[PDB]
Design an enzyme around this catalytic site. Structure first.
Site, PDB file in Angstrom:
ATOM      1  N   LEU A   1      22.002  -1.931   2.677  1.00  0.00           N
ATOM      2  CA  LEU A   1      23.114  -2.801   2.799  1.00  0.00           C
ATOM      3  C   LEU A   1      23.585  -3.178   4.286  1.00  0.00           C
ATOM      4  CD1 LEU A   1      25.040  -1.213   0.066  1.00  0.00           C
ATOM      5  CD2 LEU A   1      23.550  -3.423   0.039  1.00  0.00           C
ATOM      6  N   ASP A   2      24.052  -4.274   4.622  1.00  0.00           N
ATOM      7  CA  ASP A   2      24.411  -4.534   6.047  1.00  0.00           C
ATOM      8  C   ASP A   2      25.921  -4.204   5.936  1.00  0.00           C
ATOM      9  OD1 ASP A   2      25.889  -6.656   4.907  1.00  0.00           O
ATOM     10  OD2 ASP A   2      23.922  -8.026   4.733  1.00  0.00           O
ATOM     11  N   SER A   3      26.719  -4.326   7.215  1.00  0.00           N
ATOM     12  CA  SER A   3      28.122  -4.007   7.077  1.00  0.00           C
ATOM     13  C   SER A   3      29.014  -4.641   6.218  1.00  0.00           C
ATOM     14  CB  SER A   3      28.637  -4.445   8.651  1.00  0.00           C
ATOM     15  OG  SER A   3      28.120  -3.463   9.592  1.00  0.00           O
TER      16      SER A   3
ATOM     17  N   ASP B   1      28.002  -5.950   3.439  1.00  0.00           N
ATOM     18  CA  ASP B   1      28.050  -5.409   2.080  1.00  0.00           C
ATOM     19  C   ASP B   1      28.573  -4.284   1.779  1.00  0.00           C
ATOM     20  OD1 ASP B   1      26.071  -7.636   1.363  1.00  0.00           O
ATOM     21  OD2 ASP B   1      24.065  -6.399   2.213  1.00  0.00           O
ATOM     22  N   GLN B   2      28.710  -3.256   3.062  1.00  0.00           N
ATOM     23  CA  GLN B   2      29.375  -1.870   2.740  1.00  0.00           C
ATOM     24  C   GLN B   2      31.009  -2.320   2.659  1.00  0.00           C
ATOM     25  OE1 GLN B   2      31.342   0.061   5.746  1.00  0.00           O
ATOM     26  NE2 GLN B   2      32.023   1.127   3.757  1.00  0.00           N
TER      27      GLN B   2
END
Ligand SMILES: CCCCCCCCCCCCCCCCCC(=O)OC[C@H](COP(=O)([O-])OCC(O)COP(=O)([O-])OC[C@@H](COC(=O)CCCCCCCCCCCCCCCCC)OC(=O)CCCCCCCCCCCCCCCCC)OC(=O)CCCCCCCCCCCCCCCCC
Ligand SMILES: CCCCCCCCCCCCCCCCCC(=O)OC[C@H](COP(=O)([O-])OCC(O)COP(=O)([O-])OC[C@@H](COC(=O)CCCCCCCCCCCCCCCCC)OC(=O)CCCCCCCCCCCCCCCCC)OC(=O)CCCCCCCCCCCCCCCCC
Ligand SMILES: CCCCCCCCCCCCCCCCCC(=O)OC[C@H](COP(=O)([O-])OCC(O)COP(=O)([O-])OC[C@@H](COC(=O)CCCCCCCCCCCCCCCCC)OC(=O)CCCCCCCCCCCCCCCCC)OC(=O)CCCCCCCCCCCCCCCCC
Ligand SMILES: CCCCCCCCCCCCCCCCCC(=O)OC[C@H](COP(=O)([O-])OCC[N+](C)(C)C)OC(=O)CCCCCCCCCCCCCCCCC
Ligand SMILES: CCCCCCCCCCCCCCCCCC(=O)OC[C@H](COP(=O)(O)OCCN)OC(=O)CCCCCCCCCCCCCCCCC
Ligand SMILES: CCCCCCCCCCCCCCCCCC(=O)OC[C@H](COP(=O)(O)OCCN)OC(=O)CCCCCCCCCCCCCCCCC
Ligand SMILES: CCCCCCCCCCCCCCCCCC(=O)OC[C@H](COP(=O)(O)OCCN)OC(=O)CCCCCCCCCCCCCCCCC
Ligand SMILES: CCCCCCCCCCCCCCCCCC(=O)OC[C@H](COP(=O)(O)OCCN)OC(=O)CCCCCCCCCCCCCCCCC
Ligand SMILES: CCCCCCCCCCCC(=O)OC[C@H](COP(=O)(O)OCC[N+](C)(C)C)OC(=O)CCCCCCCCCCC
Lengths: 347, 175, 96, 83, 98, 115, 171, 88, 99, 51
Positions: free
Chosen positions: H42-44, H46-47
């Site tokens: 996951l990317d930022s 997504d987090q």
């Protein structure tokens, strides 16, 4: 509230009560009830906080509903008799409606749920008008229609009030709900003897008013509305703790105190009519009332509860509240038993 | 037919009461109490009292107008309800209608329905008086008597209304 | 101006009410014979409608007293013409 | 005597409509007491014959009650005609 | 009792049952109180008119007077109820005995 | 009867005109035509949100005053009584109290609309 | 509770007066003075008896004077009268005030031909006495005997014996 | 009655269930110790979206400074415990 | 009244409207004046307990004049019988009633 | 006598006054233009009204 407005509003409550008492027309009696209800609400909302609004809202709904039933009984009676006189009703269905209507205004169970609530949401002074002066009018109508009241209906309400009243107060710590349930239980004794002897209904109502008024006055003197708050009185006004003890014992019906007279005279009348079981049940069931009166004495007079440091600041000031008629009421509420035969003046 | 105008109006009278008793949005509840107010004014009118019938209709028209202005202020939500938009309001509305229908059915057929009281379905016209009055309206004479006879009623009613103004000023002041 | 005319109108009303008073004795006499004639006609027909009913006393009263009791609309117009009844009951209220 | 004409002249220049209201209302409550024709008003109401004048049985000792509507005995509306 | 009395007494009960069974709005339950007044008014008017009780003809008029002194009083509390909470829902009047 | 016919005629005539209005014209309905009108831009929030009444206290007073006409409209008949002394006293007493009601609310800022 | 006794259709039959209401209104003031006795005697019967069946005989004599009253107008003032009540009949309220001209022609003919004098304002409203040989009815309400009252309590008051006699109290 | 108490095992189900609904995390290899960035990819942002779901789940506000460190499902369960004082 | 002040002060506040046989404007009688008068005169002074038994006739007659139940039942029976006979071609309407 | 139900009941305020509630009612928002007789054609005057 402008002090002039407070008096005029108060004089309208009494006028509403007095109109019901002197009227000989079912129309005026209803007007009296409406006038009384009109001028009682503002006294509840004399402080404008959310609990006063809820109490006034609940009080208005209950009494207005009761009034519709009372006016409906008056119209059915007009149809079946063609007259408006304030006397025995001339139809069994109208008597049931009027009896329930009056029972709703008095707070007798099972139409009792509002009494604990309204009292809790209004000042101590307002509660005193609600639990003493607001029974005079509903009682003066039962006094004139008791011949036509159904026997089984009236006694059932009284047996329910003395039970609901006794159990409800066991669980309460607020002083405004202990007196709310004490009122309900005492309504049971007043209406239980009405079919047999209305004169003893007045006596039970007069003693109830004095003892109730004395209790509220002593609560207002120290501004105490909880059980704990009343527990600090031994550190401010020790003489006030003893008076609460005597009044509370009397309210429980213990001899030789005035609060035993209405119970004593009620039992006599019922037995003379061969009603042995009911007075026995009422008398025993009243031990519930005496129990939660005894907890107040334990926390108030018979023991010394923990105090606070800032309590020392109050020692230096006098009690500046009016406490009107309190010295006279306290005497009449404990030391009237020797003058029992004076009850004949009520006839 | 025509002989049963009062009974027909009274049926409509009950239907209005079932209307707002179901408690839809007070906008429609106020409408129901206006319809029943009108036909209720008709029933009294057919019994001779025209001043009384018009008075109640007039007084309820004004009162229900104040309720309307209050509904838009204190008693409104995003989706006001109708008699069809709730099962509680629908269930109550259909309940009251059927209970009226079964009373009209049995009274018009059996001619005698006893529920608490005995009711006779022969027709309201059978009890009316036969003779005429004088050169005046009997109900009008009685309403005029409020001042020559009803001195005590005027005083309490006048006093009660005066306190009513004072009372609502205290209650609604707030703070 | 308004007071004199109103005062004149009270005198006109008296002259109108007196004329009524001079006629009422005749109208009372006519009304009596009209009601009694109709009560008998209702009684006469009932005799031919309850001729067989076992437990029935024709023309029996419903009151204990023997005093005269003014008949109600149902009795007087028991089975008269349908439109005759409608004008007898609602004729005045509906006449505008 | 100098402040009575200062309150009146102050209100008359600020509340002319209220002055006309109290002044008109005052005369309604006062003049009926002082009027001499108020008695006639009540007498005309009693003179309007709504009911039928039910006659009396002549016991033989009623000389103040007329025997015919056109007899001298009995109240007369002569005052009404000239009023 | 003629067949009209059934409907007026039937109407009064409908209003009475409506009042005792609140839904959510306080204004909806205020109308039922006004509805009961209209039933009693009509029922009294039929009874009084029918028997030619002349002096009683003023009773229904006096009835309306106190019929509205409740409505005025009832709306006054409704204003004070909505001020505290913003709506006239009855479920917000649960501070007492709870 | 005669009144009923007149009432039935006036409302039947109006209904026909309403029926004719909806069934005579050629129609062309789509979403953007039937949307609420707020001067060319979309409204923000429903028209069913609460609408404050700044004259609520004046509205309640209207109920109480609107009753006085019920007690005052009999006066034309009342004046015909033989007891004019009592009837005159009570008619003025009733009206005077109504004025005292008005003067109390007026002085107490009752007739002033809130903010 | 018994049968209601009613007259036969033969007992209720009499020569009726079949003049419209406009005719009676126009001729009520002279009718209220000429036929006063036969019908003031009737109304007293009607009020005292409180029974239509007990004053039928007096009722017939009311029609008699009423009929003979019109025969007199029909034989002397036939034409001036017919002009009079025709004018009254024209109005929907049958107003006197709009026919004062034709009234004068009718008042003068009866005054000259018959000697009739119109009653003055406030005359027909008077309360008059009428001599009748009919006995005064006893118990016109057919009321039963009223119940005998409760006996009255008499005797000078004396203090209660031994006091209240409430349990143990000695006073 | 008084609601059932929050227990560290109760929180754990909530977190994993919320993560399970997320459409970017593969349910196969989502362990209570797996890492959002490195393991799940996951990317930022997504987090950030996951942390928003947790706020809806437990109905309380999480500051941005704290969410910068909730890089695996475990510390989420720890963080929820610290706020509700669920020592368990 | 609980407090019969009116009797003490001799002021009529509401007894003028209690019964329908009292004095009315312009002497307008009620429909059941005669019956209400007799019941009240029968039952004056003896007290309510006695009047419940000794003046029972005068009160049943009054209750009939008010609601007319015993009268409508009679009419109801005749109508039932009549519609039955006229249903099987056995009842011939009299002339005036219809024509 | 505490039970399952009355466990959460709280003592009433010492002085009987409960804390006032937070933001409850919003002013109505109205577009006073641009197609308005008084908006001069091209004035979108967004207003917040209390009544
Ligand atoms: C059985 C016989 C025994 C009967 C016992 C009667 C005594 C009751 C206990 C008195 C309590 C007390 O000391 O007052 C404190 C208490 C003060 O309350 P607060 O919250 O501190 O302030 C009140 C206002 O906010 C303050 O407003 P404000 O500051 O703007 O000024 C207004 C002024 C206003 O002053 C007045 O009180 C006006 C006086 C009105 C009474 C008129 C009497 C008749 C003429 O305030 C007051 O209330 C004065 C203090 C109270 C003195 C009351 C003395 C008379 C009471 C005894 C008569 C009872 C008659 C029934 C009461 C009305 C029923 C609805 O007074 C009351 O409010 C209670 C009023 C009495 C209600 C109970 C009536 C008993 C019913 C049974 C009667 C049986 C017959
Ligand atoms: C029927 C005839 C009855 C005659 C009663 C005459 C005494 C009543 C007037 C006393 C008075 O002004 O305050 C009452 C009363 C004051 O209430 P409080 O708290 O009882 O007064 C105690 C202070 O020490 C009040 O005292 P203070 O320190 O404020 O000032 C000394 C006070 C002296 O006032 C006093 O002595 C207060 C105590 C008088 C007795 C109050 C109770 C009423 C006695 C009759 C009830 C007896 C109980 C029934 C018998 C049952 C046994 C069968 O001086 C006066 O008030 C002169 C009164 C003569 C005017 O005023 C009101 O509540 C408003 C009315
Ligand atoms: C009070 C009840 C007992 C309390 C104890 C606790 C009991 C609680 C349970 C209650 C049980 C039910 C009630 C008791 C049973 C009564 C049953 C009955 O049949 O009644 C008959 C009873 C007597 O009838 P009797 O047998 O035919 O005649 C008695 C003798 O022949 C004598 O009669 P006499 O006419 O030949 O002579 C009268 C004699 C008085 O009579 C007696 O004292 C003895 C008679 C008692 C009868 C026996 C009852 C048993 C209890 C004995 C109580 C002891 C009283 C003496 C206390 C020490 C003081 C000397 O001497 C006088 O005092 C002269 C007259 C004075 C007139 C006053 C004028 C107004 C001024 C008032 C000023 C007030 C003082 C201010 C203070 C200033 C201080 C600086 O009448 C009553 O119904 C009254 C009942 C209440 C008794 C009052 C007696 C004392 C009066 C003075 C008060 C002193 C304090 C009393 C203690 C209270 C402290 C809390
Ligand atoms: C039966 C169904 C078939 C009947 C034929 C039909 O649809 O015609 C109805 C027609 C067709 O429906 P319509 O909606 O297309 O007509 C609308 C009017 N026009 C066509 C001119 C745009 O509708 C009508 O009832 C006629 C409308 C005029 C009536 C106005 C007077 C009313 C009183
Ligand atoms: C004699 C007739 C007796 C009265 C019968 C009338 C029945 C009225 C119920 C109408 C249907 C109804 O109100 O719904 C079922 C009701 C629950 O109410 P409901 O609003 O449906 O709640 C779930 C959906 N939100 O269920 C109930 O509460 C039934 C209450 C009765
Ligand atoms: C179905 C049914 O008939 O139930 C009637 C029930 C019992 O009453 P009842 O019929 O009189 O008992 C038998 C006596 N022979 O009685 C009922 O359940 C009816 C309940 C009526 C509601 C009573 C509430 C007080 C309202 C009083 C006004 C009069 C109400 C009755 C008239 C309305 C119906 C026409
Ligand atoms: C037998 C019975 C007959 C008597 C009836 C008794 C009832 C009379 C009242 C009924 C009518 C209700 C009005 C009563 C209130 C009077 C008006 C009032 O209260 O005004 C108060 C006013 C407050 O306003 P404020 O903010 O102070 O602005 C002025 C600054 N000074 O502050 C003021 O300025 C007050 C100034 C004094 C107000 C005087 C009002 C006089 C009213 C009577 C006038 C009658 C005389 C005229 C008629 C005589 C014939 C021509
Ligand atoms: C014949 C003589 C007898 C005459 C009887 C008259 C009664 C006939 C019916 C007329 C309408 C009665 C008023 C309707 C009562 C009402 O307003 O229902 C309120 C109540 C609202 O509940 P709510 O919060 O909306 O949620 C429902 C979830 N169950 O509703 C509910 O809780 C559930 C729905 C109840 C609706 C059915 C109740 C109507 C029947 C009551 C009969 C009582 C006897
Ligand atoms: C939910 C709806 C409420 C219930 C309505 C009743 C429907 C069932 C009637 C069947 C029995 C019957 O025959 O009753 C019909 C009755 C009586 O009518 P009538 O003119 O006296 O007929 C009989 C006399 N004839 C033969 C001379 C015509 O109708 C009503 O007047 C009730 C009101 C009508 C509905 C008004 C609201 C729309």
């Amino acid at each position: 509230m402008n002090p002039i407005i407070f008096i005029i509003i108060l004089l309208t409550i009494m006028l509403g009560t007095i109109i019901v008492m002197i009227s000989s027309h079912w129309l005026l009696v209803w007007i009296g009830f409406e006038m009384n209800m009109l001028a009682i609400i503002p006294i509840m909302m004399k402080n404008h906080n959310p609990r006063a609004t809820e109490a006034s809202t609940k009080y208005f709904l209950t009494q207005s509903t009761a009034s519709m039933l009372l006016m409906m009984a008056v119209i059915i009676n007009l149809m079946f008799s063609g007259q408006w006189t304030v006397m025995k009703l001339f139809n069994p269905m109208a008597s049931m409606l009027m009896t329930m209507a009056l029972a709703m205004k008095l707070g007798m169970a099972p139409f009792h749920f509002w009494v604990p609530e309204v009292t809790q949401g209004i000042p101590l002074s307002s509660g005193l008008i609600l639990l003493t002066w607001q029974k005079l009018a509903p009682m003066s109508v039962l006094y004139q229609i008791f011949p036509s009241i159904n026997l089984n209906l009236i006694l059932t309400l009284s047996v329910l009030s003395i039970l609901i009243g006794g159990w409800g107060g066991l669980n309460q710590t607020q002083l405004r709900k202990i007196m709310a349930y004490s009122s309900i239980a005492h309504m049971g004794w007043m209406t239980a003897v009405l079919p047999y002897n209305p004169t003893m209904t007045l006596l039970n109502l007069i003693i109830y008013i004095i003892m109730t008024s004395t209790m509220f006055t002593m609560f207002m003197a120290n501004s105490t509305t909880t059980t704990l708050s009343l527990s600090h009185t031994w550190n401010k006004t020790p003489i006030m703790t003893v008076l609460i003890l005597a009044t509370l014992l009397s309210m429980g019906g213990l001899p030789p105190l005035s609060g035993f007279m209405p119970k004593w005279m009620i039992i006599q009348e019922m037995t003379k009519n061969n009603s042995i079981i009911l007075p026995t049940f009422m008398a025993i069931t009243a031990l519930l009332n005496l129990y939660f009166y005894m907890r107040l004495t334990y926390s108030t007079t018979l023991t010394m509860f923990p105090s606070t440091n800032n309590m020392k600041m109050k020692w230096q000031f006098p009690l500046m509240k009016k406490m009107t008629f309190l010295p006279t009421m306290v005497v009449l509420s404990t030391m009237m038993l020797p003058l029992t035969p004076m009850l004949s003046v009520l006839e | 037919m025509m002989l049963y105008i009062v009974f027909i109006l009274s049926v409509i009278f009950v239907m209005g009461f079932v209307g707002f008793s179901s408690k839809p949005s007070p906008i429609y509840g106020g409408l129901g109490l206006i319809v029943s107010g009108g036909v209720g004014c008709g029933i009294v009118l057919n019994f001779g009292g025209s001043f009384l019938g018009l008075m109640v209709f007039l007084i309820y028209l004004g009162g229900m107008m104040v309720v309307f202005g209050y509904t838009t202020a204190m008693a409104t939500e995003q989706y006001p309800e109708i008699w069809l938009s709730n099962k509680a309001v629908l269930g109550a509305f259909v309940t009251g209608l059927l209970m009226e229908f079964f009373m009209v059915y049995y009274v018009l057929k059996d001619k005698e329905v006893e529920v608490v009281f005995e009711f006779n379905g022969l027709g309201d016209w059978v009890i009316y008086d036969t003779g005429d009055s004088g050169f005046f309206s009997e109900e009008a004479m009685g309403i005029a008597a409020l001042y020559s006879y009803g001195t005590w009623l005027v005083i309490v009613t006048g006093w009660s209304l005066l306190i009513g103004v004072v009372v609502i000023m205290e209650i609604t002041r707030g703070n | 101006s308004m007071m004199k005319w109103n005062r004149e109108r009270r005198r006109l009303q008296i002259e109108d009410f007196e004329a009524r008073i001079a006629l009422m004795p005749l109208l009372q006499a006519e009304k009596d014979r009209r009601v009694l004639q109709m009560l008998r006609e209702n009684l006469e027909e009932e005799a031919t409608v309850m001729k067989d009913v076992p437990g029935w006393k024709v023309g029996e009263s419903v009151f204990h007293t023997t005093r005269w009791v003014t008949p109600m609309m149902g009795e007087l117009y028991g089975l008269r013409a349908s439109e005759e009844v409608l004008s007898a009951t609602y004729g005045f209220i509906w006449y505008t | 005597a100098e402040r009575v004409a200062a309150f009146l002249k102050n209100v008359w220049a600020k509340e002319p409509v209220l002055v006309a209201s109290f002044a008109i209302a005052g005369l309604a409550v006062i003049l009926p007491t002082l009027s001499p024709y108020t008695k006639y008003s009540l007498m005309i109401n009693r003179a309007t014959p709504y009911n039928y004048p039910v006659p009396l049985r002549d016991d033989g000792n009623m000389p103040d009650v007329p025997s015919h509507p056109q007899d001298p005995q009995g109240p007369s509306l002569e005052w009404l005609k000239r009023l | 009792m003629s067949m009209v009395y059934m409907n007026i007494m039937m109407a009064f009960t409908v209003s009475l049952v409506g009042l005792l069974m609140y839904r959510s709005h306080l204004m909806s339950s205020l109308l039922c109180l006004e509805g009961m007044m209209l039933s009693l008014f009509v029922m009294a008017a039929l009874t009084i008119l029918n028997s030619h009780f002349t002096l009683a003809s003023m009773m229904p008029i006096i009835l309306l007077v106190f019929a509205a002194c409740e409505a005025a009083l009832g709306l006054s509390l409704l204003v004070m109820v909505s001020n505290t909470y913003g709506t006239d829902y009855v479920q917000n009047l649960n501070l007492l005995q709870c | 009867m005669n009144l009923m016919l007149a009432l039935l005629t006036n409302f039947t005539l109006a209904t026909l005109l309403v029926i004719i209005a909806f069934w005579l014209p050629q129609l062309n309905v789509y979403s953007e035509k039937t949307s609420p009108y707020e001067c060319g831009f979309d409204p923000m929030g429903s028209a069913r949100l609460p609408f404050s009444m700044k004259f609520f206290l004046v509205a309640i007073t209207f109920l109480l005053f609107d009753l006085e006409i019920a007690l005052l409209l009999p006066l034309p008949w009342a004046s015909q009584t033989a007891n004019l002394n009592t009837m005159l006293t009570m008619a003025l007493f009733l009206i005077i109290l109504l004025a005292v009601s008005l003067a109390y609310e007026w002085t107490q800022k009752g007739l002033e609309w809130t903010e | 509770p018994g049968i209601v006794e009613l007259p036969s259709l033969e007992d209720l039959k009499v020569q009726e007066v079949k003049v419209s209401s406009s005719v009676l209104k126009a001729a009520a003031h002279h009718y209220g003075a000429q036929c006063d006795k036969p019908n003031k005697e009737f109304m007293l019967c009607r009020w005292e008896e409180k029974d239509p069946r007990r004053c039928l005989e007096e009722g017939k004599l009311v029609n008699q004077c009423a009929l003979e009253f019109f025969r007199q107008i029909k034989r002397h003032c036939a034409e001036p009268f017919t002009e009079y009540w025709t004018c009254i009949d024209y109005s929907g309220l049958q107003l006197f005030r709009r026919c004062r001209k034709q009234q004068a022609q009718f008042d003068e003919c009866v005054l000259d031909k018959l000697g009739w004098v119109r009653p003055d304002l406030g005359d027909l409203s008077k309360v008059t006495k009428v001599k009748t040989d009919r006995p005064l009815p006893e118990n016109p309400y057919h009321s039963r005997a009223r119940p005998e009252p409760n006996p009255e309590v008499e005797g000078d008051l004396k203090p209660a014996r031994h006091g209240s006699r409430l349990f143990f109290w000695t006073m | 009655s008084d609601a059932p108490p929050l227990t560290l095992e109760g929180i754990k189900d909530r977190v994993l269930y919320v993560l399970k609904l997320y459409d970017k995390i593969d349910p196969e290899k989502l362990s209570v110790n797996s890492h959002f960035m490195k393991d799940l990819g996951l990317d930022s942002l997504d987090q950030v979206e996951i942390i928003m779901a947790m706020e809806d789940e437990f109905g309380f506000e999480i500051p941005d400074i704290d969410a910068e460190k909730l890089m695996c499902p475990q510390e989420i369960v720890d963080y929820i415990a610290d706020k509700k004082d669920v020592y368990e | 009244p609980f407090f019969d002040v009116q009797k003490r002060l001799g002021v009529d506040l509401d007894r003028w409207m209690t019964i329908q046989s009292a004095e009315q404007p312009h002497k307008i009688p009620s429909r059941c004046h005669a019956f209400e008068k007799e019941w009240i005169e029968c039952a004056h002074g003896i007290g309510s307990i006695r009047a419940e038994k000794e003046c029972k006739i005068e009160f049943e007659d009054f209750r009939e004049c008010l609601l007319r139940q015993k009268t409508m039942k009679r009419l109801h029976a005749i109508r039932r019988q009549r519609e039955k006979l006229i249903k099987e071609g056995k009842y011939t309407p009299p002339p005036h009633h219809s024509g | 006598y505490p039970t399952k139900e009355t466990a959460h009941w709280k003592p009433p305020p010492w002085n009987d006054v409960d804390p006032p509630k937070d933001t409850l009612v919003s002013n109505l928002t109205l577009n006073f233009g641009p197609q308005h007789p008084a908006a001069h054609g091209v004035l979108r005057l967004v207003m917040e009204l209390s009544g």
